[PDB]
Amino acid sequence: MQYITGLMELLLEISPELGGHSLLVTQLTSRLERDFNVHIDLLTLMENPNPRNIYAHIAAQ
Amino acid sequence: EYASEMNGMEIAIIGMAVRFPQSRTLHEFWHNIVQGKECVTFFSEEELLAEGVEQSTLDNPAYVRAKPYIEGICDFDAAFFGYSHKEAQTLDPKSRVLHEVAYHALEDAGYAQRTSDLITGVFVGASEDVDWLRRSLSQIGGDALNRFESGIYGHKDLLAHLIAYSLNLNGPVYSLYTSCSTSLSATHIACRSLLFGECDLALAGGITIDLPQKSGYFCQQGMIHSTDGHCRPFDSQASGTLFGDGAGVVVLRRLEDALAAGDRIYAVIRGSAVNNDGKQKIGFVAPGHEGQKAVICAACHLAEVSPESIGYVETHGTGTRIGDPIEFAALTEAFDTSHRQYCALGAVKANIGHTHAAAGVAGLIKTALVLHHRTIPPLANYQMPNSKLDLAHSPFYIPIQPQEWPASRMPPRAGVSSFGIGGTNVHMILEGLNPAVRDDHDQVRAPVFIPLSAPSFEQLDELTQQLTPLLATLDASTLAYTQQVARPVFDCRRVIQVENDGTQAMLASLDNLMPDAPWGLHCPDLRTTNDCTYAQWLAHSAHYQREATALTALLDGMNIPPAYCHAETWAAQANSSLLIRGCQTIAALKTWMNLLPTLTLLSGAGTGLLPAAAASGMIATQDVLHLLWEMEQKALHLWLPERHEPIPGYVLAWQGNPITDAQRNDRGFWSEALLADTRELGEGVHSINWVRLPPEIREDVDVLRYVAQLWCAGINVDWAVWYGTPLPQRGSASAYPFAHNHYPLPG
Amino acid sequence: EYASEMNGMEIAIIGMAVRFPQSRTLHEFWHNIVQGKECVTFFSEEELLAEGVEQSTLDNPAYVRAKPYIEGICDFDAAFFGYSHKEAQTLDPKSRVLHEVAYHALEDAGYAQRTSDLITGVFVGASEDVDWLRRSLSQIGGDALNRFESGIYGHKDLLAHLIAYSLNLNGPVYSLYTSCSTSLSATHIACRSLLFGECDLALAGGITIDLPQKSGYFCQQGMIHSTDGHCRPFDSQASGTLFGDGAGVVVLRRLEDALAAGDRIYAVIRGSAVNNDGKQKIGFVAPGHEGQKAVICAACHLAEVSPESIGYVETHGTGTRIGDPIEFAALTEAFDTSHRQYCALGAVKANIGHTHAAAGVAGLIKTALVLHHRTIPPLANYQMPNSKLDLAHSPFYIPIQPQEWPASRMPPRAGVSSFGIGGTNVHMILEGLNPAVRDDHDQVRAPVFIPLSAPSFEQLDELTQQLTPLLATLDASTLAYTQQVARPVFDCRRVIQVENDGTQAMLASLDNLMPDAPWGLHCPDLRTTNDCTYAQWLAHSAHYQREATALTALLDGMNIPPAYCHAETWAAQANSSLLIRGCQTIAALKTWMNLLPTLTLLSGAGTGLLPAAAASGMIATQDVLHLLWEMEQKALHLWLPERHEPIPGYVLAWQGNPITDAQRNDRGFWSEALLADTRELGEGVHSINWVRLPPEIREDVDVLRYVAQLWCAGINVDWAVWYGTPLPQRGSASAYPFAHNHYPLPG
């Protein structure tokens, strides 16, 4: 989750569900998460609009 | 007949032409819609390695191999439009396709080569993809004159000026682009600038061709490209969409004019709304919800149709798992009704794949055909509905089998839609046209004839090979009429005769004719031969009774015959009066020279020389109509007329001796010429081809067969003159046979 | 007024903005027109070498070194428009300029941030060269998603959708191209779409940027380009054409709306025609003649203007050796009038050079400014006329020194032409507007107050450096009214006082202020004082008189003595009674509630507690009036009315202690607080900043000086409820300062 916030703060650069949520943002998050120790699916990629629900699916998998 | 209330603003659609994947004309487009067939194709490795694909991508699992492709993008008939070979070589393939599609969509409307007195004017709009841009600048150059030619010809936005220059069109012309809904934006501003009273015949359009044909795409997991090769809208199995190729052009004219001139109308466009979505959407690249329901309510309200009479809604339907409940939700909220399950749906993007900038006008041609043929076609690849939809408490049901249009919905109405990717939204309520009765009575009336034409023999063989499915689907009488009147003519000709059951017998040509010999008619002697100059059959011609009412307005004035006037029943007492016999001749020759423009001589062999001078222009009608009734008493002395100057052409002979200013000023020849020679071939030979009817003639169709044979011989004919009081309805006949060269793809 | 008839077809131009060469705003463009100097620059032998021209082309004698360049292609405001940094990096410089120019057009029309009630379209053309195409095709696009981003953002197809999305506009959008009159075809679509009732504003205008900004151009022999560097139109030494750069946007709205809302109008468009040349010429690149004469006669018919009262014709004026006799003969055959020389001529294409997509809108903006300022401007390079020009027999004469509008051609009427390359030929009769006249006589009127505002101190300082060139040209009262009302406000603020004759001086800061506090007002006891919470200075507000009329009507129903029921006469006999003083205080409190919307905590000590109550809404009005009446004569048996909860904003007090639900129902508390007297000046210590005037008031403008010293601090005071019954006209004012980053060009 920390690295996910690190790349979204790298891409958008605001220090404080209001992410990109568009063409490249979702795929760029989804690429390294499968390389990460977490396991993410494309179905929960298109179902989760917040890093809290993503982290909830992280604890489920 | 229209059968509703005419407000100020309606627009007809009087002819369309398409070239879509696995669909080369209109008849195959309706045959592909009705059956529910899909038009995507699947390649294999061998026909892909010949097109130049690296082997390190086929083994990748991201290359799903399918693409809806145009057939024949690399051929063009260069010399017909006005180009030469290098100028036809340097053209972007968009323009080579759209020239031929726009000429077919003119010629299907009737107004082919007749727009030099109508202010027509194009509005097409075209997309762009980058591969031909990469292939066009790999040439060398030094900014020369040829480079400036390649700078305006190879542009993708001097398309509409090239079309309206090459077909001689003199009205407004634009080249719009609003993303993914190009054709419906162009059709909407064509309806506005048609309603202002600016142009008369507007043409919509839109074309996209992605140049490396026969190649797959690259699927992605976080996108909208379908990972199957298949596009399924409103389905529980759905994956994505499918980007293909296309073409397509309509022709739009106002309602009142296209009901006055009697044309073939498919639909009548009523209302049309446009609005951007704005910043209510999340970013830039996705449409919302409120814009969709606002445009549907605005276009339903602006055209005075309540939304509980619309039995067909062509959606957008791209086939994603996200866009489809959104579009069904907007289409439920905008229809504010509470009736249950009365309206169908559909999406052409199942059948052909998503065309990139012709998608709206693909929708428009499908809904126009639906209101014209009156069925409701199936939705293709539909098994079980999407789980987030509820069809029960909502007006829409998805058809699976082709149905007739249900009663208690008449007159039919249907509504198209096309929302772009970026915001511009269009919607357009259509209302169909109620067809005629077809009162031909299924009787055993007559064979009718069809005059094909093309400028060379191979194209003529193609055009006569075209005729079998066109006779199989259409009707034969209206096909023959709209091939007679509203199509052009060319050099090498042929006639095809159609009998009552469907047979095709080619029509035999003449045997003995000479090319330099002019044409002419023969008039008999009224004293002995009571038969007229072929006036036994020309009674039903509408021009002939107009000349009869013109002649009876002058005969009844001063001559005062013994109670024989008003031009009613000349078929009962034809053999008695010389006056009606001379009138007959005058009217018969008048019709027989307005029927054929290349008719000059009007000779005769006794008692017809004065009607011949009357209707050739040498003598005015007043003195000869004065003299004809006084010829009945035949007692007192003859009268020499004022001898007016005739019209150019129409010189007169007596026994095959056409002479001018020799015997037209004396009196001895005029007194000598009033005798009966009684010799049909009294001239021997004088090189004059004669309009002689065949000896074995009984029915009125034999004279029309003769008129067809003189059409085949090589002189133009005024066909509309023959037909009676109900002029048969115009319709759709036959495309043109283009002659393909080959032009290589650059690079 | 306007001073002619009004049919349905008027469209008013209510604001324009430009970025033409050497012309970075609008007042410099008019100065450059009326002098006659030309904006083309010349280079040396080294500034070309410094930016990527090798020496092997410099020595070529067929190389003319000139190009009318814009300055500031690169820069942009990054975070204003709702962008990131990378998204701002990946754009295309046409978009990176036309964002700024269209926002200056809305800021000049007045509707800067008030587009929340109207339906605003966009209709923007553009033109695409080949050099950025070779710069952007060969760069690494990336994966499919970055290619999607670069194809959606970085192209000339999504330009008008970006202007309509970054600002908040939700009307129709389009993006035309008709190849040299792109701007005037977009303006003509905007007229035809305003007149039906889709949109209520529009935009227009194109852009053209050729990316190596400082570089020469190859002269040659076949294609037309100038062989010298100068574009002389209609001259004996005419050589060619000069291709340049440009921008430009207007804003259009109907005439009935733009007079019944008070706006500023430059010139009003009366008629518009478009056709195409057709095939009625020789080549695709050569100009026709019948097309030009037909479009001029149709646009002089459709606008009901006879071509006798047209005083100034703005033509194309390309400047080649062939186009100028053709254009002049077309004009003198359309103006079929047989007078002698009366109408001037001109061309902007000598001042700036050919612009290639904005040449139509350069013509429209120059003709709008000439009708607004009424000065015929001279032709830019003109010594002796062309040899085959028949000047003295034709209606036109060509000026060489700027002269005033000739006083026998009123109201002024003009005419704009722009003919493309083989495409549409657009013409458009404009018509000027008779002015509004000041009622001063060079007198010592009053100081005014100008409220500048910008979001940080650097941008504020650059904005306040604009008041010297604006005040040297305009007049100093409409500038102050436009800056007060029809412009937005921001955080860091400053006001500038302008006296009768120059002498700008910043208003002093306001001291002794404690932040995060409520603002309150106090009205003392009315038995002694006469200043009824400053109701003598507010007597000219024309909002004070509305409440005075309402209270006059309310006291007319019940009050016993006359001459107290007459409005406009309270101040004569106010000093004798108490009822008049209470009636004045009610309206003064409501006007000071209007002025200063964020005033919250009222108060009142002694008898003033009752008008403070009636203004707040706690008691009543009529009960308060007659209660004050028995306190005028009797002051026995007070009848306390039952209280309310006044307004969801305001809080009432007694001395400085807010009674927030303290007692509200005790008769002893009101009687003790009210019945004896107060006689304190009061207000020892609490935490609310009182609205107290400085004690040296001696005029009527001094309260305006105090309310501007309030607006220099945080109070968002309305700037319109102070001015009297003729409100001043709106007019034009300063334009925003943009914060400039730097984005380099990917060569």
XYZ file of C-alpha atoms in Angstrom, chain C residues 388-635:
248
model
C -4.511 47.095 -65.959
C -6.656 48.437 -63.113
C -9.480 50.636 -64.389
C -9.646 52.851 -61.363
C -11.261 56.152 -62.365
C -14.356 54.577 -63.939
C -14.976 52.210 -61.024
C -16.656 52.957 -57.705
C -13.535 52.567 -55.521
C -10.674 54.783 -54.380
C -7.702 53.723 -52.275
C -6.522 55.949 -49.416
C -2.959 56.820 -48.455
C -3.487 58.908 -45.289
C -5.926 58.134 -42.441
C -9.094 60.180 -42.775
C -12.295 60.407 -40.753
C -15.504 58.693 -41.773
C -17.030 60.808 -44.551
C -20.112 62.425 -43.132
C -22.498 61.633 -46.012
C -22.353 57.818 -45.625
C -24.247 57.285 -42.392
C -24.892 54.869 -40.559
C -21.541 53.285 -41.411
C -21.621 50.060 -43.376
C -18.679 47.887 -44.371
C -17.962 44.551 -45.963
C -15.595 41.625 -45.418
C -14.440 39.131 -48.031
C -12.158 36.099 -47.878
C -11.882 33.699 -50.821
C -10.222 30.342 -50.352
C -8.121 28.120 -52.584
C -10.757 26.343 -54.633
C -13.071 26.105 -51.658
C -15.792 28.205 -50.133
C -15.983 31.950 -50.846
C -17.399 33.852 -47.850
C -18.710 37.461 -47.703
C -20.369 39.219 -44.787
C -21.909 42.725 -44.581
C -21.279 44.376 -41.214
C -22.835 47.576 -39.887
C -21.696 50.002 -37.254
C -23.405 51.250 -34.180
C -24.126 54.933 -33.432
C -22.299 55.931 -30.263
C -23.195 56.882 -26.709
C -22.327 60.442 -25.709
C -21.010 61.600 -22.328
C -22.828 64.417 -20.528
C -19.746 66.057 -19.003
C -18.249 69.398 -20.045
C -14.601 68.823 -18.978
C -15.411 69.436 -15.320
C -13.991 68.483 -11.939
C -16.336 65.456 -11.564
C -15.153 63.158 -8.701
C -12.458 60.674 -7.828
C -13.209 57.150 -8.999
C -12.011 53.846 -7.560
C -10.449 50.914 -9.419
C -10.396 47.511 -7.680
C -7.464 45.395 -8.948
C -7.246 41.744 -7.874
C -4.890 38.861 -8.608
C -3.913 35.609 -6.829
C -0.313 36.504 -5.808
C 1.747 39.635 -5.349
C 3.944 39.270 -8.451
C 0.957 38.910 -10.775
C -0.691 41.810 -8.964
C 2.297 44.068 -9.568
C 2.373 43.186 -13.260
C -1.362 43.842 -13.422
C -1.049 47.277 -11.832
C 1.590 48.208 -14.351
C -1.177 48.155 -16.977
C -3.024 51.255 -15.820
C -0.808 53.774 -17.605
C -1.482 52.614 -21.226
C -5.137 51.890 -20.465
C -5.675 55.270 -18.852
C -3.878 57.104 -21.642
C -6.441 55.878 -24.207
C -9.787 55.063 -22.578
C -11.830 57.201 -20.241
C -11.465 56.804 -16.524
C -15.028 56.194 -15.378
C -16.164 53.202 -17.432
C -12.844 51.584 -16.554
C -13.718 51.931 -12.886
C -17.268 50.654 -13.306
C -16.205 47.627 -15.370
C -13.483 46.745 -12.881
C -16.030 47.062 -10.074
C -18.788 44.884 -11.485
C -18.114 42.627 -14.456
C -14.781 40.960 -13.535
C -14.001 38.203 -11.014
C -12.218 38.627 -7.675
C -9.321 36.750 -6.126
C -7.275 36.728 -2.921
C -4.617 39.456 -2.848
C -6.261 42.842 -3.354
C -5.400 46.521 -3.863
C -7.415 49.600 -4.913
C -6.173 52.663 -6.842
C -7.661 56.155 -6.619
C -7.669 58.186 -9.829
C -8.415 61.890 -9.415
C -9.687 64.412 -11.956
C -6.382 64.801 -13.838
C -4.178 61.712 -13.614
C -2.174 61.431 -10.372
C -2.653 57.790 -9.490
C -2.325 57.160 -5.784
C -2.784 53.913 -3.872
C -5.399 53.922 -1.133
C -4.062 53.534 2.384
C -4.183 50.259 4.240
C -6.787 49.776 6.940
C -5.291 49.364 10.415
C -6.666 48.166 13.818
C -8.350 45.083 12.345
C -8.705 41.792 14.163
C -9.190 38.787 11.855
C -11.591 35.801 12.153
C -14.224 38.064 13.698
C -17.835 38.916 12.849
C -18.668 42.320 11.413
C -21.303 44.327 13.227
C -23.076 47.666 13.215
C -24.421 49.900 15.961
C -27.137 52.566 15.883
C -27.322 54.807 18.975
C -30.342 56.166 20.828
C -32.695 58.172 18.628
C -33.933 60.617 21.270
C -30.743 62.705 20.941
C -28.761 61.920 17.783
C -29.723 62.853 14.222
C -27.420 60.588 12.164
C -29.892 57.756 11.590
C -27.030 55.240 11.090
C -25.736 57.392 8.207
C -28.903 57.793 6.200
C -28.020 61.157 4.740
C -25.254 59.949 2.432
C -27.220 56.923 1.232
C -30.136 59.041 -0.022
C -28.982 58.798 -3.647
C -28.454 55.041 -3.723
C -31.648 54.147 -5.630
C -31.997 51.173 -3.326
C -32.661 53.346 -0.321
C -35.532 54.925 -2.221
C -37.125 51.533 -2.881
C -37.358 50.758 0.829
C -38.499 54.338 1.417
C -41.332 53.769 -1.074
C -42.247 50.468 0.609
C -42.373 52.056 4.063
C -44.320 55.000 2.624
C -46.918 52.538 1.345
C -46.974 50.686 4.654
C -47.467 53.830 6.750
C -50.091 55.145 4.303
C -52.561 52.543 5.575
C -52.675 53.627 9.206
C -50.721 56.789 10.119
C -52.785 59.717 11.378
C -50.927 63.011 10.576
C -50.177 63.960 6.964
C -46.844 65.381 5.670
C -45.119 62.420 7.378
C -46.504 60.057 4.740
C -44.709 61.857 1.910
C -41.503 60.287 0.647
C -38.574 62.478 -0.520
C -39.452 64.946 2.273
C -38.374 63.055 5.416
C -35.117 64.993 5.791
C -36.871 68.367 6.023
C -38.810 67.643 9.226
C -36.885 64.661 10.616
C -35.392 66.746 13.434
C -38.774 67.483 15.026
C -40.076 63.946 15.578
C -39.055 60.342 16.194
C -41.200 58.377 13.714
C -39.261 59.775 10.761
C -35.943 58.871 12.417
C -37.060 55.285 12.987
C -38.323 55.089 9.407
C -34.968 56.335 8.099
C -33.024 53.868 10.231
C -35.012 50.887 8.874
C -34.077 51.618 5.278
C -30.500 52.579 6.131
C -30.042 49.245 7.876
C -31.443 47.372 4.894
C -29.172 49.220 2.465
C -26.133 48.553 4.691
C -27.322 44.949 4.706
C -27.218 44.983 0.923
C -23.895 46.670 0.831
C -21.559 44.236 2.552
C -23.316 40.830 2.288
C -21.231 39.343 5.098
C -22.385 41.791 7.780
C -23.930 39.684 10.527
C -24.330 40.959 14.099
C -26.716 43.886 14.468
C -27.074 45.840 17.705
C -28.938 48.709 19.295
C -28.878 50.591 22.595
C -31.975 52.294 23.944
C -34.679 53.205 21.465
C -32.540 51.945 18.564
C -33.078 48.362 19.708
C -36.495 48.491 18.028
C -35.300 49.472 14.508
C -32.419 47.020 14.874
C -35.037 44.408 15.718
C -37.268 45.299 12.780
C -34.323 45.221 10.386
C -33.192 41.857 11.746
C -36.695 40.415 11.516
C -37.315 39.476 15.138
C -40.502 41.422 15.762
C -42.515 42.899 12.916
C -42.795 46.037 10.903
C -46.255 47.604 11.411
C -46.243 46.716 15.111
C -42.797 48.318 15.423
C -44.037 51.498 13.721
C -47.083 52.049 15.905
C -45.147 50.905 18.998
C -42.699 53.695 18.193
C -45.731 55.962 17.799
C -46.997 55.456 21.365
C -43.396 55.914 22.411
C -43.563 59.232 20.563
C -46.531 60.674 22.410
C -47.620 58.384 25.262
C -44.951 55.872 26.461
